[PDB]
């Protein structure tokens with residue numbers, strides 16, 4: 283209903299929905315995200331402003347914005363693959379070779395964002411959309427924010443994202459660096475793909491399962507399901523002191539990351 287028709291509901295979140303929109307002339311498809319500024323106008327001015335900076339093969343394409351009353355419409359690549367969340371078999375995961383591919387692509391996407399000084403802040407499988415040839419695209423810049431401007435980094439102080447994905451320091455410190463938290467959530471997504479389960483509800487000393495990982499009890503799952511090469515990488519990503527935690531340029535030199543698996 284706006285030059286294009288709204289065919290089916292797609293991602294009914296809080297604040298609005300995402301629809302599938304076909305143009306009836308050209309037959310082309312898009313995702314219309316629909317935010318009713320009555321049911322924030324501030325976090326939404328940022329989303330689109332961030333979205334206009336973005337252009338990469340692993341980040342959902344931004345086509346434009348119209349205001350139509352209270353109603354903001356963001357015109358967004360439609361990913362006919364859907365969510366990576368759905369290619370994770372509960373308790374089992376997915377073939378190592380697909381995980382490694384999705385991880386290569388997620389890395390590419392994140393390097394990109396980080397190189398333009400943007401942290402996504404909410405990387406989880408629900409936010410990783412797949413296109414028609416199963417290429418992974420980083421989605422939903424609703425919580426994204428700028429952490430380098432004019433070549434100066436600034437620490438974040440707002441807590442956000444999704445607890446099982448979040449990095450311990452975001453719980454513990456008043457200010458933290460933006461990049462390592464994005465790395466940590468990327469690691470949790472790896473664990474998710476390779477084991478089909480989340481290792482803990484939040485990285486708290488108060489959280490049993492989290493305490494067992496710091497004690498290297500990798501004899502429990504989801505670790506036992508994982509396999510020594512990728513698990514060695516997870517050991518370098520899910521490090522607690524954000525400063526000792528591996529960085530992306532170094533993930534790119536890790537053995538499992540550079541292992542041939544897939545045709």
Ligand SMILES: O=C(O)COc1ccc2c(c1)C(=NO)c1cc(OCC(=O)O)ccc1-2
Nearest residue numbers: 292293300313315359360361362363364422
């Ligand atoms: O193939 C299917 O079964 C459905 O395909 C989908 C399913 C969910 C979503 C899409 C495509 C999207 N394409 O862009 C999409 C975008 C979304 O954006 C959310 C945001 O920007 O917050 C959310 C859900 C979906």
